[PDB]
From a paper:
These resistance determinants block drug binding by catalyzing the transfer of a methyl group from their cosubstrate S-adenosyl-l-methionine (SAM) to the base of a defined target RNA nucleotide within the ribosomal A-site. Here, we describe detailed structural and functional analyses of one of these enzymes, the kanamycin-resistance methyltransferase from Catenulisporales acidiphilia (‘CacKam’).
To assess the relative contributions of these two interactions to the observed β6/7 linker structure, individual D21A and W203A substitutions were created for further functional and structural analyses. CacKam-D21A had an activity equivalent to the wild-type enzyme as determined by the resistance conferred in E. coli to kanamycin (MIC >1024 μg/ml). Crystal structures were next determined for each CacKam variant to assess the effects of the D21A and W203A substitutions on β6/7 linker structure and crystal packing interaction. Despite the loss of a potentially important crystal packing contact, CacKam-D21A crystallized in the same space group as the wild-type enzyme with essentially identical unit cell parameters and crystal packing arrangement. Critically, the CacKam-D21A β6/7 linker adopts an identical extended conformation retaining the double cation-π stacking interaction of W203 with R43 and R73. Thus, only direct disruption of the interaction of W203 with R43/ R73 through the W203A substitution is sufficient to induce changes in the β6/7 linker structure and the crystal lattice. Together, these structures indicate that the R43/W203/R73 interaction is the major driver of the novel β6/7 linker structure observed in the crystal.
Numbering used by the authors: 8 to 226
The structure:
């Protein structure tokens, strides 16, 4: 269930309850990578319960080590790294998110987002409270060669194609009322995708497709 160092242990239902009650706000990152991005949201907002959810738990191990240390040594006790896929999220993670974030997704998470697949979008909808925003950010440079296999068979997602492909309708039918979709050129990449193999301040930027939606009633 939950990362505790380099070992994943079980999270006591009670402790998971107190942590929720104790938090000003709950933020859920689906698809976290090595989870440095989730770690920094936790450091910047110690009162947020930041929850990183992703099946590939071995990659979040270093983040978990650094987060387990004492406060003065860069520890972050408000960071919860959950080992789970979004398509079959456990019932304890149902309706907890004040905000759901999908920051530069890869693999199935990325493909399900571009295609508007029921299992990914409903899993994302399952974790959110009514009114909670869905923030999806995808770097557009994934559509230059070589285009990643998980999306190589699709056309480039633009603000205009999001509507004409019916993605905006599939989102609304699954409980996601789209509010805004736009391209933001020259976006500092360190804002939505940190990494322990990357140094902050490199100033690397990219064009990023943003999509905000709000959790409503499914059809």
């Amino acid at each position: 269930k939950v990362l505790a160092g380099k070992k994943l242990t079980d999270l006591d239902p009670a402790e998971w309850a107190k942590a929720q009650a104790s938090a000003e706000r709950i933020l859920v990152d689906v698809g976290t990578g090595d989870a440095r991005t989730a770690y920094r949201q936790a450091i910047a907002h110690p009162e947020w319960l930041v929850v990183g959810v992703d099946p590939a738990w071995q990659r979040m191990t270093e983040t978990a080590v650094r987060a387990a240390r004492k406060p003065a040594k860069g520890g972050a006790p408000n960071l919860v790294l959950v080992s789970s896929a979004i398509e079959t999220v456990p019932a304890a993670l149902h309706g907890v998110a004040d905000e759901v974030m999908v920051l530069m997704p890869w693999g199935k998470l990325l493909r399900g987002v571009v295609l508007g697949e029921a299992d990914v979008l409903s899993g994302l909808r399952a974790v959110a409270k009514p009114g909670a925003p869905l923030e999806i950010s995808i770097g557009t440079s994934i559509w230059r060669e070589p285009i990643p296999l998980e999306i190589r068979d699709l056309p480039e997602l633009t603000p205009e194609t999001v509507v004409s492909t019916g993605l905006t309708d599939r989102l609304a039918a699954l409980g996601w009322q789209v509010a805004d979709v736009r391209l933001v050129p020259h976006t500092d990449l360190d804002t939505i995708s940190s990494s322990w193999a990357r140094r902050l301040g490199s100033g690397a930027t990219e064009t990023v497709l943003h999509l905000r939606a709000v959790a409503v009633d499914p059809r």
